[model samples]
Target: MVFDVWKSLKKGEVHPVYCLYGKETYLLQETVSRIRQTVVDQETKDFNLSVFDLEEDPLDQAIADAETFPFMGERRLVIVKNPYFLTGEKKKEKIEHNVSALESYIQSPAPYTVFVLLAPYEKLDERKKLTKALKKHAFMMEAKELNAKETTDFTVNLAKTEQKTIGTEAAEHLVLLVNGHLSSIFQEIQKLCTFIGDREEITLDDVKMLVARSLEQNIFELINKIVNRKRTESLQIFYDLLKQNEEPIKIMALISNQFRLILQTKYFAEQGYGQKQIASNLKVHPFRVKLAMDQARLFSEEELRLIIEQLAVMDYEMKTGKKDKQLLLELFLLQLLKR
Candidate 1:
């Protein structure tokens, strides 16, 4: 969706108002940067641009700035950040936003203004009259997470834009390295492209050479499946690995390892641990901490302990015999939903 916004921006179509929000941090910031570049030039930026923080000031001032005309060009830019009131959330301080005031502006927005709202929320309150009106009038883009497959495709497309090619396998490997995070994958692509400087193709070898190494990534998404109660998807991951000669005992071991990681992840989260801090402490990638953080929220300390211990016991049992491995694994995912 944001890609189309870029396409339009490239064609010199700039909307009077833009509302970019959501989970993917990079997309939100990047889209804003791209728009800023599109609408204003460097020399006139000081006079033509105004960035307002809704947390510090009222929305009325941003609206007032947007109404002001430009000195250098046909349009001026008014960027608004941290519109907490746009969500259903209660306020932190005493300042109030006259959100109702925005409804009138949407219908007759400033002709010579590019008013932008960068709300980093997952979703805004749809029932709110102002948001509904804004969505109808403004260009809306939500920077949601790209899944493993989509992230892989995005990697290749981004590479192509830089005049380089990546093999499908290489792209997939890069995705797996970062546990399918676009920003992480994006970060490494910059390094890889620069390293292969005078070269064109980014081989699978290049991916292995540049990207971080971790086999535990296979289980990273598996936990996402389990935590979200995707039973079929959960078993499919386990089954696919088994089909590929992944030993059931190691599968159990890794799952056990991840549960332990999630346990520590939860502990860090409770103690106010930031992502990079937990990543540094655990010696894992920040993306690992990011995924672990999500899974950790879904599991309690008691659940993680018992799950880790149960898997370890199962690992021993499987190591000792031809056990009902699949069924035993199936049972935990099935019941983790209940408890």
Candidate 2:
């Protein structure tokens, strides 16, 4: 749906009024930027572009500006930010907005102006007359958090915008590396594009080389090594993290969390839950659940519990200054390898 709106904006199919609301600020901002580029020229932007903070500026003033004819241009763009009244959120400010005026303006927006209501809130109060009126009249676009397919599609489409093709494996790898955060994935994709200038295709290796792993991903790999009984490689990964000046206590905490996830994944799988269901139940990305399931297969419930208990003891020892933190983690890794 967001892609369809993007396609419309790309084709200069501009609308009179737009309601851009969502949790994904990147998508919302990108949409706004595209709309601005499509409607207003750079030279006339100073006179044609108007931005208002609804918390500080009056909605009626913005609407009145929308009614004004464009200066030295064929079209004007008015962006109204922080429209909390559209949502169920309560504001601390004593300012009041004229909802009726906005509603009326939506009914018959200025022909020469592209009026936009930017509400960064997660959801709007649809039950409110004002919200319903705006949605009914405006070109509505939601920037909600993307699911896996949507995220991959975004990655692929973004690469295409730069005249590059990202392989399916590369796109999937990028999503996992960033833990499915769209904003971070967008940034990483830009970096990759810059790195491979003039290259037409992005491969899995390119993604692995260019995209830096999140701490959670690194921890996942470390745990994977330990569970697979790769003693030297597991210790080397830990040492590599220490070389990066990672805190031992922090690493231990992540290890504890990863183990807990694996345990839960194992339990859910035993209860006949599939990957998607486990991911939903855990409120984590499906890729992570899949990885946890793979690692979960290497250990029995008793073994997972044993490692968890050992990690707790190691954590307490390090916090109480009874053991060297780095050495404690190394010992734990060795113990896991031995098991």
Candidate 3:
């Protein structure tokens, strides 16, 4: 049910007020940064870029700032990060008291000011009057985390933008290496920028050299391979990881959790729910829900249930000081292949 707000920008539609809410802090920051850079000229950014920390100021100050006239420029940019005031988690009466003022401001936000509110990964109470007002009068863009496929697409586009090409395998490797950590992805991409300077393509060697192997990729692929019953490939990956000094118990635990997520995602999907509903139900990002949706399709309900029981047994054995951890994992993989 989530829509892309960035698409509107290309169609000559710009909002005076925006609520960039979501879990991915990097995307939120990047969008806010882009809006600031695009909505106002670099020469006038000093005068136009006004940042407000919700922790330090009251809601009235944000309202006052919004109402103030823009500088002698095209537009003014107002970026608010970590709007704890909007959450009302502190239960402060001042925040409650300012609710009316906030609602009033949202009703008619300043024309020449672009107000950006960041609430990464948290949902707002739509019952609140101010929440309804903002939805009614301003732009609301939620920052969603990208799935493995989407992540691959994003990385490829990014590489192209940097005048570098990335192989499909390399892009997929980067996604697994970073997992859901967009900030880490940004840092890794920056490293790639330096390592691949004047180079036009990124290969498997480039990924191995620049992106260190993490448990994330191993765990995800292991589960995918197991669910699909790729016996040789799964066992090979497991043994390779163990040879690389990966913790056997950690690998087992990751497999168990991956199954749990698959089960949860499958149940939600069967209920005819969308990504947003599944994400809220599972306490994960919608992008994560999307991943689960794809992974869930690899297993049947009865098969997943049986495998989960087996994983629980494996977890118990591993935790109770099982001597042959690799053997235990291999056994589980074998069992999955039999299924």
Q: Return the top candidate by TM-score.
A: 2
What tens-digit string does per-residue lDDT give for candidate 3 at 185-229?
667777897798788888878887878766766788777787777
Alpha-carbon deviation at 155 in model 3, angstroms: 2.3
lDDT of 1 by residue, 1-339 (tens): 777787788889999989999767788888999898998888898888999988788888888888888977877989999878778876766577787777787768998999988998778999888888878998999886555566777888878756788988999988878677677777888889998989999999999988864446768767777778787887787677777877666666777878888899899889998875787688665656677788888877888888887887777777677778766766766676555
Candidate 2 structure quality by residue, lDDT tens digits, 1-339: 567777888777899999999767778998899899899899989999999998888988899899999999999999999988886766565478888988899998999999998998768998999888987898888887666777888889888776788987899999989877777887988888888888888888989988888887789888888877787787788888999999999999998998999999999999999987787688765656777898999999999999999989988898895677888887788777887
Off by over 4 Å in 2: 39-47, 89-95, 193-199, 223-233, 244-339
**TM-score for all predictions?**
0.63, 0.68, 0.64
> How high a TM-score does candidate 2 get?
0.68
Misplaced by over 4 Å in model 1 are: 91-94, 160-167, 191-201, 212-261, 264-339
Best first by lDDT, ranked: 2, 1, 3
Residue 245 error for model 3, in Å? Answer: 0.8
Which of candidates 1 and 3 reaches a greater lDDT? 1
* Clash statistics: count for each candidate: 0, 0, 3
Residue 290, candidate 3: how far off, in angstroms? 3.6
